[PDB]
Tab-separated table of C-alpha atoms in Angstrom:
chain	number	residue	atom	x	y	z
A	1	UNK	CA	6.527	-52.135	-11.905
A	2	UNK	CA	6.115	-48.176	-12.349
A	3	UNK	CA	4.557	-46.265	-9.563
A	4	UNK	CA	1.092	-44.743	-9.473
A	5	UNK	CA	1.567	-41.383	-6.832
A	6	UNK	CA	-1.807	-40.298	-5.056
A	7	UNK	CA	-2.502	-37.011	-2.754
A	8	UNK	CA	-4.816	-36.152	-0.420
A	9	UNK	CA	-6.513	-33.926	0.161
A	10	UNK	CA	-7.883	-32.496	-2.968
A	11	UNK	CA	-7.474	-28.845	-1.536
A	12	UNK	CA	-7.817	-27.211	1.784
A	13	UNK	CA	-8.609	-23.678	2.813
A	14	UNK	CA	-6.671	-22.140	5.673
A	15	UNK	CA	-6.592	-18.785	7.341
A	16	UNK	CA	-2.687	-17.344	7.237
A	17	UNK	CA	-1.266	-18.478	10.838
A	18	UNK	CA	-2.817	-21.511	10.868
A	19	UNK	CA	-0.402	-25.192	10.319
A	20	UNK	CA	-1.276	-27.623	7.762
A	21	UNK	CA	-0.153	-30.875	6.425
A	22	UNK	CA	-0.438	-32.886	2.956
A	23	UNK	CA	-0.282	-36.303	2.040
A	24	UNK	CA	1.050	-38.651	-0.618
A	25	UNK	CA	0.502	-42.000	-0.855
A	26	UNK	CA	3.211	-44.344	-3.557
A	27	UNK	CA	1.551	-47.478	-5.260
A	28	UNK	CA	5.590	-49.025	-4.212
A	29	UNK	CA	7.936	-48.350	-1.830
A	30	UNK	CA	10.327	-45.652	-2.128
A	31	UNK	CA	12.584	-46.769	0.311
A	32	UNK	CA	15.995	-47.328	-1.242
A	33	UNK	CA	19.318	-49.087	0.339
A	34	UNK	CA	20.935	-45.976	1.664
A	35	UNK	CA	17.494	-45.676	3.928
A	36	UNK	CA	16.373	-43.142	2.026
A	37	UNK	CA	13.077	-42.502	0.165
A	38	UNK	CA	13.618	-40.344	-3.022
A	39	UNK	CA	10.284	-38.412	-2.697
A	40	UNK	CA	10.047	-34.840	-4.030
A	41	UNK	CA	7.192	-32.144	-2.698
A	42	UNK	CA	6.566	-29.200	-5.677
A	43	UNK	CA	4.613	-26.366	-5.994
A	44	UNK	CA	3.238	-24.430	-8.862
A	45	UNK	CA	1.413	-20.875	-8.020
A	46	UNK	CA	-0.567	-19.266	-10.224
A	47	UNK	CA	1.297	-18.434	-13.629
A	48	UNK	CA	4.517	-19.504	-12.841
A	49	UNK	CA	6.558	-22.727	-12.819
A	50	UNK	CA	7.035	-25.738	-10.730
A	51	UNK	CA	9.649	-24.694	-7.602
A	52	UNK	CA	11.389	-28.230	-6.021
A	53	UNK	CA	10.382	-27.954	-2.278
A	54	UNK	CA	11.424	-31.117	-0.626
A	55	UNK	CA	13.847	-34.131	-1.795
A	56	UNK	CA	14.483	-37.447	-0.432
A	57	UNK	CA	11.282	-36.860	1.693
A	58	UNK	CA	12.331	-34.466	4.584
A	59	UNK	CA	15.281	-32.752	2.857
A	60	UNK	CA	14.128	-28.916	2.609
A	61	UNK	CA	15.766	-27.240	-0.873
A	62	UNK	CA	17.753	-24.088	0.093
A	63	UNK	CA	16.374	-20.632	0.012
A	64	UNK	CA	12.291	-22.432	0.710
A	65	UNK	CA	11.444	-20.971	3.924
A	66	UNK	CA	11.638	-23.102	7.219
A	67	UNK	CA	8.151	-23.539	7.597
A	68	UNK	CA	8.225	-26.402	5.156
A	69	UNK	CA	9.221	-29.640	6.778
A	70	UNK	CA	8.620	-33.118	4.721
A	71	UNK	CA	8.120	-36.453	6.940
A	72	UNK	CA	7.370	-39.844	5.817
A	73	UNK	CA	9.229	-43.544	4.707
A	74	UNK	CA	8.513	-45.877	1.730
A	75	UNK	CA	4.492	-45.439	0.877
A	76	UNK	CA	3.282	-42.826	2.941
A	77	UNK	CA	4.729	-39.119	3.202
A	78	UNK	CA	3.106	-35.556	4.622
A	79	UNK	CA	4.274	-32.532	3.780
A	80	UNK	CA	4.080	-30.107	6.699
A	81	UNK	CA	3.769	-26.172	7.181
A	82	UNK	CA	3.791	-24.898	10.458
A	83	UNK	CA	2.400	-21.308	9.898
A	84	UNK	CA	0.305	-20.364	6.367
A	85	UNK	CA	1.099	-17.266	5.004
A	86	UNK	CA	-0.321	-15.539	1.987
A	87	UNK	CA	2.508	-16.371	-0.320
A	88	UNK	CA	1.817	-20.322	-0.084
A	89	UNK	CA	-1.193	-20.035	-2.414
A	90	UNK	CA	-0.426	-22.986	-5.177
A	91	UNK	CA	-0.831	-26.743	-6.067
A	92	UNK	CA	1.041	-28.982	-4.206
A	93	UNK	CA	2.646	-31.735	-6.318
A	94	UNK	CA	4.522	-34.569	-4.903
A	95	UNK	CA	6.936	-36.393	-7.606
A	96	UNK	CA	8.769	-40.036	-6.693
A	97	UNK	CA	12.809	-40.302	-7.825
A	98	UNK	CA	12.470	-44.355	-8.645
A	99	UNK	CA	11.695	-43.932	-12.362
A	100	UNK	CA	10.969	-40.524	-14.452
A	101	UNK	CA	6.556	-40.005	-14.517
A	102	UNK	CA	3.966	-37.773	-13.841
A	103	UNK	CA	3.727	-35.788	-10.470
A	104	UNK	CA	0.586	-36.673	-8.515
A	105	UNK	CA	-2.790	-35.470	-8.799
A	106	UNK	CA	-1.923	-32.055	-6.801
A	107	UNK	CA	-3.033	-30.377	-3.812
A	108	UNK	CA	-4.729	-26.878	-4.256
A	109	UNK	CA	-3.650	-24.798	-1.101
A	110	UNK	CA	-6.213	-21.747	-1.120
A	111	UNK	CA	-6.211	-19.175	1.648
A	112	UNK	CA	-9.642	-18.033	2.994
A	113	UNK	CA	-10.413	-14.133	3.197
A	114	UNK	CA	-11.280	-13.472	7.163
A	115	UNK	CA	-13.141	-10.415	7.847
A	116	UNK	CA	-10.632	-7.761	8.396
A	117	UNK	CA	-11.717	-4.721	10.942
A	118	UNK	CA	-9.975	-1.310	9.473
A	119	UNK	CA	-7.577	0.717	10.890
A	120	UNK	CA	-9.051	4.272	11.688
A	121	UNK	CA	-7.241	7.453	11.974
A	122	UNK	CA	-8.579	11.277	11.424
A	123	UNK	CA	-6.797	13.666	9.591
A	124	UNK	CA	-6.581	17.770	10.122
A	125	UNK	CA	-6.595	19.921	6.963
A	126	UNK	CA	-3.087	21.394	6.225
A	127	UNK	CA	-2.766	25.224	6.532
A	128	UNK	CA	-2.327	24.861	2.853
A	129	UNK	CA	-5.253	24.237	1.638
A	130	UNK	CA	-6.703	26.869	4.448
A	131	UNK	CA	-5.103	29.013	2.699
A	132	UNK	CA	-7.148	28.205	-0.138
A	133	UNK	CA	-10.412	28.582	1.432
A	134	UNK	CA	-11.469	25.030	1.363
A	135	UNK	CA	-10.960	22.686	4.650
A	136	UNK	CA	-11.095	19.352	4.262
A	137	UNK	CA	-10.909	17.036	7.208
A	138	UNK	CA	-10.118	13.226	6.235
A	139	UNK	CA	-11.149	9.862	8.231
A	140	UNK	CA	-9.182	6.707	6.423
A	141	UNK	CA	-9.833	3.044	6.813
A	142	UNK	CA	-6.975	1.131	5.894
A	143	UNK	CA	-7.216	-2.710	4.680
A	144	UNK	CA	-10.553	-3.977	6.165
A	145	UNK	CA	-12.519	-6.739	4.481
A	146	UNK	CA	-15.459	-6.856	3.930
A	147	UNK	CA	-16.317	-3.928	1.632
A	148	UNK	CA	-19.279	-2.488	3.748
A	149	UNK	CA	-18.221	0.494	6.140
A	150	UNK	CA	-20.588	3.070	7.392
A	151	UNK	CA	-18.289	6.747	8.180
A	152	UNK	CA	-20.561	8.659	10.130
A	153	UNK	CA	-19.192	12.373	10.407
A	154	UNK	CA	-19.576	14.489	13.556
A	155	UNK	CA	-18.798	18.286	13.806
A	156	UNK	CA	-19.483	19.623	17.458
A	157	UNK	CA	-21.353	16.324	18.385
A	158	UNK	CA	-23.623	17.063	15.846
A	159	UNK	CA	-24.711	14.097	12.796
A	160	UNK	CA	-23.425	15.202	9.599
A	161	UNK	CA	-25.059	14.060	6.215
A	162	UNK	CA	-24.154	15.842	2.572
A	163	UNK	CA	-20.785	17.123	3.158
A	164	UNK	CA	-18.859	14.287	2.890
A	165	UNK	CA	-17.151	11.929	-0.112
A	166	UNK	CA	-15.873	8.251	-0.212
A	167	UNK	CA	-12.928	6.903	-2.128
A	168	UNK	CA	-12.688	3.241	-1.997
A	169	UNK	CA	-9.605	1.512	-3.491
A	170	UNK	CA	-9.949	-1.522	-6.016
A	171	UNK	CA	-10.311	-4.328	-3.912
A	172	UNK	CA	-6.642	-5.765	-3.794
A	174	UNK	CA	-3.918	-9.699	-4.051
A	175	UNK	CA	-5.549	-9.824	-0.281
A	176	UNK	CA	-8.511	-8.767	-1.433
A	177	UNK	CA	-8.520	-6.135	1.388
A	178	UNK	CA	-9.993	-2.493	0.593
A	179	UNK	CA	-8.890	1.143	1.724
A	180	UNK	CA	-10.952	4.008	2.105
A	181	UNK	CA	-11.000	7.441	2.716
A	182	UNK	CA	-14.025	9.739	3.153
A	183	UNK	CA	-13.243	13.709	3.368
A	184	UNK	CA	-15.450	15.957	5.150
A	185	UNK	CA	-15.574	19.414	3.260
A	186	UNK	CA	-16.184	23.037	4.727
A	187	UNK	CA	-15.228	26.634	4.447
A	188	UNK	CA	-12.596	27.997	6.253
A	189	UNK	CA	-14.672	30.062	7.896
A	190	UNK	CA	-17.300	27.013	8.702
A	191	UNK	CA	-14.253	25.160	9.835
A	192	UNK	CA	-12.759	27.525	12.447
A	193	UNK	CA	-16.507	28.138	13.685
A	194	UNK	CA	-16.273	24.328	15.418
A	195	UNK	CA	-14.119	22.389	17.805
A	196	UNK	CA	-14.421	19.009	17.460
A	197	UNK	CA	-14.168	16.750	14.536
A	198	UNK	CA	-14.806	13.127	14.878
A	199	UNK	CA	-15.663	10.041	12.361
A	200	UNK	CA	-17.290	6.988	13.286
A	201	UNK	CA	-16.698	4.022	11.563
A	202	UNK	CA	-19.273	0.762	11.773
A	203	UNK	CA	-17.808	-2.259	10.054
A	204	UNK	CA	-18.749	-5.440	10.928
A	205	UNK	CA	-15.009	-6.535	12.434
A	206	UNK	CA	-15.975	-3.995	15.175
A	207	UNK	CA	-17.620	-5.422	18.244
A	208	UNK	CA	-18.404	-1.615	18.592
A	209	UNK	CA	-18.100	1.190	15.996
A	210	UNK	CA	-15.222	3.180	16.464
A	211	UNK	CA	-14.505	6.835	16.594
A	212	UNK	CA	-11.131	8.752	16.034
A	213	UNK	CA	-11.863	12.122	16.450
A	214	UNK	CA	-9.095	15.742	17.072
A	215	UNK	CA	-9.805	19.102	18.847
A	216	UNK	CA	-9.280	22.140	16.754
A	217	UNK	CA	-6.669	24.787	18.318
A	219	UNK	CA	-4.514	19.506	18.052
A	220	UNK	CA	-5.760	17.493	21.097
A	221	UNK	CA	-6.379	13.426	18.921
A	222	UNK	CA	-8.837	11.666	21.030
């Protein structure tokens, strides 16, 4: 009699770091006479084709990275990663070896977006561009999700508002965004001040944080 292959669960949605673990259910046993279970664990990410994971159940394929490890004996197997990372986005297709048929009804791994706090650091204009007559002090935000960041500029203590400009990158794929907003003066404006700080709100900050550097360069 041919073999009907189930999975559960449909899909699950995991941070990266976290373990997980598949089933797959056989309508017959696998189990052959050598004591082995011919069970194969495939997966198929987004535009490309099938890559064998597992064979005869817990056998990992070489080259598949050791946090796959396959379990399981005639009906009922699990397919097992100890640490989600980014790269395991795909549907999860276990296949039995008895008789040649149809993989099983998949499970979708997706990976969920966690807010990401940014990484702040301030940026001193080059005597370059001093030389130019233009100073330009820059405050980046590297990889935060989500997109909403306040940059709060501060020259001698004092609020800034017009003199700055954002550039957000297209959201990314960890859908993660950098940012960079420049604060623009004179030359002569610039060397007339001390201290330039930005301040960066975002809600993975308990507290808003603020990278700021003394002019003549003390980073605090």
């Amino acid at each position: 009699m041919d073999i009907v292959m189930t999975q559960t669960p449909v899909s699950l949605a995991v941070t990266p770091g976290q373990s997980a673990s598949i089933s797959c259910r056989s309508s017959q046993s696998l189990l052959h006479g050598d004591g082995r279970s011919y069970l194969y664990w495939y997966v198929q990410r987004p535009g490309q084709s099938p890559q064998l994971l597992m064979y005869e159940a817990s056998t990992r394929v070489s080259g598949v990275p050791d946090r796959f490890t396959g379990s399981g004996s005639g009906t009922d197997f699990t397919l097992k990663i100890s640490r989600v990372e980014a790269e395991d986005v795909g549907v999860y297709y276990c296949m039995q070896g008895t008789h040649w048929g149809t993989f099983g009804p998949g499970t979708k791994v997706d990976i969920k977006r966690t807010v990401a706090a940014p990484s702040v650091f301030i940026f001193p204009p080059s005597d370059e561009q001093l030389k130019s007559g233009t100073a330009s002090v820059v405050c980046l935000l590297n990889n935060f999700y989500p997109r909403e960041a306040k940059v709060q500029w501060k020259v001698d203590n004092a609020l800034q508002s017009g003199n700055s400009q954002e550039s957000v990158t297209e959201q990314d794929k960890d859908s993660t965004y950098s940012l960079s907003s420049t604060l623009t003066l004179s030359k002569a404006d610039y060397e007339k001040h001390k201290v330039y700080a930005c301040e960066v709100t975002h809600q993975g900050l308990s507290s808003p944080v603020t990278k700021s550097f003394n002019r003549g360069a003390l980073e605090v």
